[PDB]
Design a protein around this ligand. Structure first.
Ligand code: SF4
Ligand code: SF4
Lengths: 89, 232, 50, 344, 32, 89, 32, 32, 89, 232
């Protein structure tokens, strides 16, 4: 039930007036593999691996590239779904 | 070594010395105010201390924490001055917190002080003996009814500076208007919203391609057009 | 050549048949201030590594 | 005066500049600090940086030093292509790390203190310095075991083998036997020559092998003269074990005898010189000839106006000087200055 | 002068610690 | 106007004697994409993207790769600049 | 014993903070 | 009250420094 | 020879009880070039460059890929090592 | 649990005990000096304390801060010894700051101390009872006219070490000359600048390919040649 009480104004303002009214947004770290391509934390346009990674969340209209769950190559069936199928010329 | 005069060194050497006086001068010319002179004491005759012809005024002011070290961070000395009568408030509301002005500090032994101060005069008066150092006000850490405290800094500080400093932008010009690099000098043409005008007071470039085309100065455009096609 | 500006070219071999050739046009921004220039004319320009 | 091709200076500099292309590192740093459109010209004027220290640093950078292959090359030359955007402090401490100068703000201008041999400035004995309540005027501290590096790997880009970076190993075989092996990694900034990388590593190894001592003491009312970079000599009686400093109690011009504060003994087979402070204020060395009762000496000549209670030093030929280099001068409220130094 | 002195010294120590961390974070310090 | 004065020698020397005479040079962070290829802060041999990046500065003789401002492919004209032009064999 | 004790305690707190940060920097500490 | 007070204040300063570093380590602090 | 003694238990358990009985394992930093591929500090399956890098250590059975010391392409000799050499059909 | 002898434990558990004596031995054999023995007190007869046959000398020495904790950083105890008469200065100028030498600390109850110390003798003398710990001097935090202060450390410290620690270099050999891996044992051939010589005192390898070829020992070359071609 004792102590000394200090003034926080000079300590709070030390960063900037803006951070007192609203936090600051984060910027991804820079990698030189991109040849200067700049990234952001809320967009991804390429297909990523699946295991060990989180399932993303999309909040608005945007172009998306999504984690791959399956991928295969096989020979295609000749029938197109109709009763009549014609092979060759 | 600072090139201190010989008489000052001889005074420093002696066993019994005269008073050491620090003469503060606050310069607000760059910001837009007048230069203010202060000193901590009055002279022997109860008048403002006269050094050369300046006549520094008596006022409670103290500066502590000065240092000469380059190993770590910058020095950041501290200066405290009282505003019981509201002078510092008047300067701070007007000149935007006294941020950016210069503070100059002189240390002169009382032996060399001007002959006007002493009632019997001084036979050893010599106006060339002083030690000067310049700083720049950085912040006003506190302002109250009792006192006001500033934090000084070196004129050459590197806190917010990044070296290359020039960005290649696709649609925005980085030059300063009518500067050396933009190289435009002519009649007022348009506003900052690309609206036609002729008054010289409200002529500002919008830093856009249309704003530059108003001047027919497309040649000196700061930005590099059509980069965003390649970056994509 | 000159210091402020320069130009150079190596002649193109004539074609035999009636065929068109592509052309690649590239601009590179080397440095900021006044720089002195190439060290040895066109030999200082390297495509791939040649 | 500078001639970039032949790296030769004509005469005395007059403070004016001319435009030319040069590899000199000092003027690359000057261009970094004071160019308006891309550099730091708007914050930092041309008057804040002292062009006079950069002149002598540039002279030191252009001297001819042997390379391994048998030719001669300048010590330091700036070859850099700065592409990424970094903090100004990082670029400044990468420019000042290659030429080994510490950027310290003098009272009026920003000065650069380089590490090259220099002569002494002032001597501080046990009577000039403040005595704390502890009773120890000087406090010495040394470097740690694991802070004395012995092996350094330096990266530099190779003009001959393709401009990809290549590393060089610098070692000290004798030091490793004593302190073990302490390995460090380092980058040489603006390096395109093997000799420069090797010298950059050798400087660390030698400066951490040779200079391993620091001193801290307080000097009152006469520290106005000192700025970082000054080289001072310390004459500690307790360290040496023999009386080497004091103050003069009385001077006799007609007989040329000085009565000292404490007794001294002349060395055998040598000449001892006693430093004195002249009336003008500059040190004047005079050769000792005899001591009568230990207190009194008989100098060859008595400098003009040697007042009572003035510092005297005895300079024996046997003892080796103990130089030091200031790194900080903390002004204090009592009117004293705290001075910190590292061995030189 | 009793435990109140210890509490006051602890508060002053915490304030000094925050000040020192913020001083070190700027250019040239340990954290930079 | 009071306080305690400390000795900084043991605190300064803690890093090393060399750091008291000259700052230390910076080393770029390591990325495993390079397969151990090592980088430096004052050399770059490849062509990087332009937007949002700074215009570099060159201080000495060196091989340089530079940010691209334009790049296109078109059909070349037959005329070589002289009055005489010969098409085909 | 007046504000002088507070100022001295502040100086000692700052010194302790620097020492603690340098201690924590080395291997095994929080900052390592 | 002699050097013992200085030593006690130094120990309390070091404890405060550790506590402050651990406090700032969590979410929202300087070190986060 | 004096001071204040404190209690460390509440300070030691601030991380966790597990860290008080055994240290924690280190996880490599995440790089977006891998498209979400996750790395570990004790495995590498690809051939890396040699200069300026350490010679690795293998402690148990594992698939390895190792730093290259030499690599060249040349024309091959017709002789297979035996006395009899037959060229062509 | 340490293998403490039964008599020491019996002395520990008693209500009224004899004095606890700490005996300091500073070992400078590895550095190249002689070993020094110190103790804080004289015996009851005003002579140096005799434990076994060592006869530890009286000298003001104290070590504080010892601890047994593996959770955080290393221990780093502190040892303070006075040099009013300049002993520590003499040891430090000569043996390079006493950095790297060993310190061994023994705690022995005064009950089991040797019979020479006490004027009436000791019937319980038993030289086997002691507790031993070893440390290595790390630094000299201070050295003045009043005192000298060291900081000890554990012999097994991991501050400057990296595990693999063997660099593949294209042009430099990393082995030690005439070591186990270099495997050269023969006449002196060359100097460290690849100059011919025959004196065995100034025979040093330059760690270069020519320096190795002087020995005709190219087979055991530490470095790997022609790597920089692939790295390029
Ligand atoms: S847009 Fe054109 S007129 Fe406007 S500042 Fe830029 S260069 Fe000057
Ligand atoms: S270069 Fe040859 S002789 Fe020299 S140390 Fe290496 S292996 Fe031994």
């Amino acid at each position: 039930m004792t102590g000394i009480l200090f003034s926080l104004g000079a300590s709070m303002v030390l960063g900037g007036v803006a951070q007192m009214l609203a936090p600051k947004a984060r910027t991804p770290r820079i990698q030189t593999t991109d040849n200067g391509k700049q990234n952001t934390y809320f967009s991804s346009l390429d297909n990523m691996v699946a295991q060990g990674n989180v399932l993303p969340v999309l909040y608005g209209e945007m172009r998306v590239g999504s984690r791959v769950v399956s991928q295969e190559i096989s020979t295609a069936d000749e029938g197109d779904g109709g009763q009549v199928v014609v092979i060759g010329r | 070594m600072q090139d201190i005069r010989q008489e000052t060194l001889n005074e420093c050497t002696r066993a019994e010395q005269s008073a050491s006086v620090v003469l503060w001068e606050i310069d607000l010319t760059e910001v837009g105010g007048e230069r203010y002179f202060f000193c901590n004491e009055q002279n022997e005759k109860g008048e403002p201390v006269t050094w050369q012809g300046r006549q520094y005024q008596p006022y409670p002011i103290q500066g502590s924490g000065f240092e000469l070290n380059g190993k770590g961070t910058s020095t950041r000395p501290t200066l405290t001055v009282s505003n019981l009568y509201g002078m510092v408030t008047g300067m701070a509301e007007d000149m935007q917190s006294l941020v950016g002005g210069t503070v100059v500090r002189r240390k002169v032994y009382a032996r060399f002080l001007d002959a006007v101060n002493f009632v019997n005069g001084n036979s050893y008066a010599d106006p060339e003996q002083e030690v000067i150092s310049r700083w720049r006000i950085e912040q006003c850490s506190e302002l109250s009814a009792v006192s006001a405290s500033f934090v000084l800094s070196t004129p050459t500080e590197t806190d917010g500076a990044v070296f290359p400093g020039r960005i290649m932008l696709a649609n925005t010009c980085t030059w300063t208007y009518r500067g050396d690099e933009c190289g435009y000098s002519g009649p007022a043409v348009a506003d900052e919203y690309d609206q036609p005008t002729s008054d010289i007071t409200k002529d500002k470039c919008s830093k856009c391609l249309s704003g530059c085309k108003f001047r027919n100065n497309v040649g000196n455009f700061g930005g590099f057009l059509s980069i965003n096609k390649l970056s994509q | 050549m000159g210091k402020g500006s320069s130009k150079g070219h190596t002649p193109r071999e004539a074609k035999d048949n009636l065929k068109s050739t592509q052309l690649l046009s590239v601009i590179d921004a080397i440095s900021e201030g006044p720089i002195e220039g190439p060290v040895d004319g066109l030999k200082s320009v390297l495509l791939n590594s040649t | 005066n500078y001639n970039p091709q032949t790296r030769q200076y004509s005469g005395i500099w007059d403070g004016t500049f001319k435009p030319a292309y040069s590899n000199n590192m000092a003027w690359c740093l000057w261009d970094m600090l004071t160019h308006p459109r891309y550099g730091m010209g708007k914050r930092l004027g041309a008057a804040d940086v002292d062009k006079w220290a950069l002149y002598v640093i540039g002279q030191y950078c252009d001297q001819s030093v042997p390379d391994g292959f048998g030719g001669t090359e300048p010590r330091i030359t700036c070859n850099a292509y700065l592409t990424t955007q970094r903090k100004a402090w990082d670029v400044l401490s990468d420019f000042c790390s290659a030429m080994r100068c510490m950027p310290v703000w003098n009272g009026q201008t920003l000065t650069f203190v380089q590490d090259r041999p220099s002569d002494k400035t002032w001597t501080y004995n046990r009577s000039n310095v403040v005595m704390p309540d502890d009773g120890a005027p000087f406090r010495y501290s040394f470097s740690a075991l694991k802070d004395r590096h012995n092996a350094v790997e330096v990266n530099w880009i190779d003009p001959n083998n393709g401009w990809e970076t290549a590393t060089e190993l610098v070692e000290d075989t004798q030091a490793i036997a004593r302190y073990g092996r302490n390995v460090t990694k380092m980058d040489a900034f603006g390096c395109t020559s093997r000799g420069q990388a090797h010298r950059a590593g050798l400087w660390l190894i030698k400066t951490e092998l040779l200079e391993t001592q620091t001193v801290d003491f307080s000097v009152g009312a006469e520290g106005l003269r000192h700025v970082p970079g000054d080289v001072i000599e310390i004459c500690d009686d307790d360290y040496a074990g023999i009386s080497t400093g004091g103050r003069v109690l009385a001077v006799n011009s007609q007989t040329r005898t000085l009565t000292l504060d404490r007794e001294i003994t002349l060395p055998s087979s040598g000449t001892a010189l006693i430093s004195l402070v002249d009336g003008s204020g500059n040190p004047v060395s005079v050769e000792v000839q005899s001591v009568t009762d230990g207190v009194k000496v008989k100098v060859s000549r008595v400098p003009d106006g040697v007042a009572e209670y003035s510092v005297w030093e005895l300079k024996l030929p046997t003892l080796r000087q103990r130089l030091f280099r200031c790194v900080s001068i903390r002004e204090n409220d009592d009117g004293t200055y705290a001075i910190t130094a590292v061995q030189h | 002068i009793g435990p109140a002195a210890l509490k006051a010294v602890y508060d002053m120590a915490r304030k000094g610690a925050r000040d020192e961390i913020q001083t070190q974070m700027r250019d040239g310090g340990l954290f930079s």
